Design a protein around this ligand. Structure first.
Ligand code: MN
Ligand code: MN
Ligand code: MN
Ligand code: MN
Ligand code: MN
Ligand code: MN
Ligand code: MN
Ligand code: MN
Ligand code: MN
Ligand code: MN
Ligand code: MN
Ligand code: MN
Lengths: 298, 298, 298, 298, 298, 298
């Protein structure tokens, strides 16, 4: 299936500038050439126009920083992703902070009866305005997509929820707020924190994840936050948490997913060149995309 | 069970100065705050007064550096740990070089019929005055506690031995003198060197260790030397040995011990700020203590 | 005098992608806030729209890579800089590779009888299509501004030359092609290579430079290439050359220029976040701009 | 003249824990051995007992954090330094944050008609309870010693002021609050910021300093804050400021001071092992002490 | 079985100078001492004289750089290894680039009915003069030894092939040209790329390898290219490929090989001190040799 | 004047292996290409055959390690350098530890009435068998060449002494034994330690050195030990000493010597690849040689 790349130079979902440079850092890391090498019909649709943050004293949003601009940008993204899916192409979204997942899922979910989601991240991203200790929307996209949060976020695309909790699988988590633990626990979301990765090993984690989703969904969206990997492997991220997934574990995960052929849409987020070491993180992302799309060692 | 922290600013069990700063480095790394967050009744009893080393020519002997000061400090430590145990609290000892294990075990062992011991370290610490190539008492605590060594060390607390060889499990070993290998072999001490960790994996090493001990002891003491971890994860130690346990493997080990609920006493030793990189080692020790006491990712 | 910032996200003057991220990396390093702190009336005019490189097989340009797009972008820049000067404001241009100097000087020079230029760089940038060993236009802006080069470059702004050789001063040079040495020698351009900096010291270099220019010009443009500084201080540059100017020498230079009050326009170029270490180079640039605009330690 | 070392394990003058480990990190860096090698009669008087800070909520002034304990400890230090000077010995004080300079100067100043002061630091430390943006007393010792500040600090030792503004020379300054610049300007304190060091060179700065003081004082106290050196040379400090004095410049300054024979008392402060790289900063301090006391390359 | 060390200071099989320093870097890393400590009768036969490459312009085949000198040196190596095996000693060959494997195998293979080969490398080294994208013979030794390639290489020692494809096992592969994948696929060579190592784990990879070979061979040659390990563990190599085998995995593999007692000859190649970090790679090679020859942690 | 390069792969003058790899490390760093680029008639005569160290118990004595092999190698070196000089060529010797200076000076001195010497090093190298704390001959070459030391070293070439004390200038010294300071003081050898470099600056040090020598010699030999530079610039050396000469200071020194045209012979010693970071030190040596032989920035 042909691929369409959509860049979303968004950094309004959090406070550290630079993640808006993530899409082009990945383009410069060679994403197009990497995928073309695999014989793909790859198209780069450019970037979604993002707004400027309105003055703090003006718009109401501290538990929901930059709400209107984040919501607006996500509406455009949803529309663009929806168009790509309708054209029979695979939407590959490059961020940009994780709040863009709201738009990506909005444009994709409507096309599936039961869309599954693999949230590869050091965090749960299941906060709401009420539980968020920072007010950063990039920590709320999963909750919002499940229909929990501000209507400006949950209603993007004109429908809600995008997915069901039983169709989500979190992988690599090692930093959850108490409210998020409660959310995950109560909604019954499947989760493999670093404890399970260490205890069962990435192979088993992926086998169980793949079997779990293939058994109850008709499509699977991969939402990969580079901070899921250890900061030593992916230093250019805004919210690094030590004790993460290795470069090799991540390649294995992508290779196993490619093998399973269950991934119908994907997004690589949180790449911040401004906090990186010589584009290492963008390069890691591109290498992972390579494996995801079928690149094999043999 | 409430916890009582006892600091032992000891560096006389070896020759590199700075390990005496280990108790406060860990305090500054936030040990109290970490454990309070877990809803523990945590008490900091301060530090054991350590004497100044007596001139080697006057001390016990060339093969036992700083014998009297090490012994005296361990007597006071045993007394303190004994009182904590009698108060129904969990004794958490912060070192300080490994020679303090003699006092910790002296204060705890008397309270159990069959005390087990998990010696997490890159070394076996089973040397005696006769086998020691250095005379550093921090390389003799396990042997002394088993009743093998100078009476000044074996008799601490007024009884001997503190534990039996069949109730000890060494984990992470990768540096043993030939005499130590002989001691371990002859005493029949259970041991998982890095070979077994790599071959079986940390999950299996821990499962076997827990089952082995739970099956024959009525209490288990964890004696953790930060040099058990690889120097890249725990650089601030006096005797680093490459090819060590990772940060993740260590957290898994602590989480599995916490889950088993077999740990009745613990000590974190060999933290030397003076050989460290921005208190990294003390911070690792605190994070590990967090996991040991029940901290979970989910 | 009020300042107007113009970003030029240009990387077509050379081959390493990422320098087009230089303007926003500097904005994120806090350039606006830094200058506002000094009580300046600072305005950010945004970025000059830059084109996409046409296919190699199509347009004639190997000794002059991306000529049309570089020329086009520079025409727009010249127009924008000209407007700013006409409004009585100081034009502060952020790059972007050094080829943008062609547009900056085109927009500025026409307003002065004898515009001087301080070219702070590890290179001379005096190549022509005939002498360039790479065909990269970012190594030709000084020659082009002096009226030597392709008419598409020398005629930007509708006039030529922008400045005279006797009004230019190169500082920090340590990498010149033989043709460039000949050019500098023959045109009689004043130059302080690292040999003179080491031998005379930065204080003398600047005193002589300031006295030389103040004595024969009615305005001075500072064209600062971050690669003028040593790669250890400014690692995020496309053409690093060891044995460069120190962070302190650069601050001294900027402070002395600020003191002399001879700088009437400036541009900071070659910042490439993609080759940098956590925005260090953009940060250095901002600190230097701070000193240039009057920031003092006392 | 024999030397008496007094350690002051103080960290209450600021908020980063660890600087209280500075005295012993320097002892472990070999300060006694270094000085004995120079044929000095050296005596280590131990450490000044420092009190624990009382609960912030029940404190007297937020603009003066830990006032009582800082003042208390400084009184003891003043008495100790006073004793040493009365015995005809040179007081060498090891810190500890810079707030200890209040006690050192209190113990020394009473013994001289016109005591001079060389404040080698990246900061001025001339804030008061009214001007301080933090309430950290380590940012107030120079002002307090000149008689400006809270009486609890200015009256230590039972007299004030300790020194006159015309007898102070600041060297290496690169971080001053606006209030501090005003203070320095108005009191007429001689100051060589990094601008002057870069412009004039360390040799000239030192010749002028020595000549200025030798001409109007009968004793000179050296108060050296390790943060005066660049963070690359002295990383273990709580308030690092880039663009600092080099290792070599610092040795030159100490060697020129030794040559002049004007230093009658000294203190090395702000060494924080917990923020350091394998005791590098403590080692630098010890090497500088060596030079100060006469160690020569030839 | 006594060991005979033969150094081959060869760098002609590739283009990066320095790998010819590999034999002595390993000697300086203490290879003799390491093995003697294990009670081995160890003999160092010195280095094979390597000829100088003749001028490229006057060479016979561009697809086979330095053919004559590589072949010449490999003939001498084959004769030397042959001699060692005839004396009943174990030939331990130190390189030198991988092209020396042609001589090592030529000298050993004639002595076994069915010689097995474990090729521990990031690459397959199965290119020929026709498939090679570089003409570097170090990328052709495995193919040549199997009888595929230029007769100058396949006929070394006067016979061919040295081994059968069904008796070779590639371990750690992560960089194969398309021609090489085709070669491996078509010849039916057993291969464990990094995908299999990650998926199955090193223990399983080694158990399968040992069982596979032990079942069909009467001797096994270990050809270990240090680039098989991750560049972070073995930086001093000419063709580094990220995502490699860890230090620990390599020790485990060597220890399991030692345990199986199947290795009858070995070579450690591609160590380049000139591209290394303080002899780290040579040291790794020596530690691995220690494990291979029986060194145990307990 | 044409140049003849002679390599001396010597490491017997000290105890750290690897310095014998220095001649080829510099060759690989491109020494021939660098000098050819300057239009020199450059000839590489190869390496001097160095014997293997004789058992210390049989050699000269405990105070002169490897005496006979060092002496024999220096005899051959003197003969080779002598022939080069007779052929009217400039002898450029690449080491190899500093003990080779004995042979170099032996081959050159006989050809001059009053040969001068610039000893660029962190050390004085003026120890004798009696004063040497190690017995390493690389710490005795300057003294031996002045006729002070074991006759096996002082008589090399059949004459003694090679140079007079008043014709020697030491530059960059910062590590002298007390006996060496006494030797330098008593023999009246001109010396610029790091104190004078910092106080006067490298320009003045060089101007005085050149004028001093030009005024009393008819030829000048440059004996450059890479340890003269700071370990951060030249890490690959056996005896590093912090607080050294910078990369820039060294280039200035070479450029000024080139400009003066007083250097008639030269040697670059102590380069140890095995203690280096990717041949950085050999590369520094080559760049310095470039400057020495006339390479100019402009
Ligand atoms: Mn996320
Ligand atoms: Mn995350
Ligand atoms: Mn231990
Ligand atoms: Mn240990
Ligand atoms: Mn430039
Ligand atoms: Mn440049
Ligand atoms: Mn201070
Ligand atoms: Mn300060
Ligand atoms: Mn290979
Ligand atoms: Mn390879
Ligand atoms: Mn030397
Ligand atoms: Mn030296």
């Amino acid at each position: 299936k042909p691929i369409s790349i959509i860049g979303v130079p968004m950094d309004l979902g959090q406070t550290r500038r630079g993640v808006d440079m993530g899409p082009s850092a990945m383009r410069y890391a060679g994403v197009i050439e990497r995928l073309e090498r695999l014989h793909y019909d790859i198209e780069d649709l450019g970037d979604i126009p993002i707004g400027k943050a309105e003055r703090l004293h003006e718009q109401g949003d501290s538990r929901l920083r930059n709400l209107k601009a984040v919501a607006e940008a996500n509406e455009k993204l949803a529309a663009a992703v929806d168009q790509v899916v309708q054209r029979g192409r695979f939407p590959l979204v490059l961020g940009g902070d994780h709040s863009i997942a709201i738009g990506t899922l909005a444009g994709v979910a409507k096309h599936y009866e039961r869309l599954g989601v693999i949230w590869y991240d050091a965090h749960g991203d299941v906060n709401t305005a009420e539980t968020s200790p920072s007010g950063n929307i990039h920590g709320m996209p999963l909750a919002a997509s499940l229909g929990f949060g501000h209507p400006a976020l949950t209603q993007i695309g004109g429908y809600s929820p995008k997915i069901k909790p039983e169709h989500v699988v979190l992988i690599g988590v090692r930093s959850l707020d108490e409210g998020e633990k409660k959310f995950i626990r109560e909604k019954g979301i499947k989760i493999y924190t670093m404890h399970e990765v260490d205890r069962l090993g990435m192979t088993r984690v992926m086998e169980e994840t793949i079997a779990y989703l293939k058994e109850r969904t008709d499509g699977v969206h991969l939402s990969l936050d580079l901070d899921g990997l250890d900061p030593s492997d992916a230093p250019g991220v805004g919210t690094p948490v030590i004790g993460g997934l290795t470069y090799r574990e991540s390649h294995l995960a992508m290779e196993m997913l490619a093998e399973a052929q269950i991934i119908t849409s994907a997004e690589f987020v949180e790449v911040n060149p401004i906090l990186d070491e010589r584009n290492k993180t963008a390069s890691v992302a591109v290498a992972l995309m390579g494996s995801l799309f079928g690149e094999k060692l043999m």
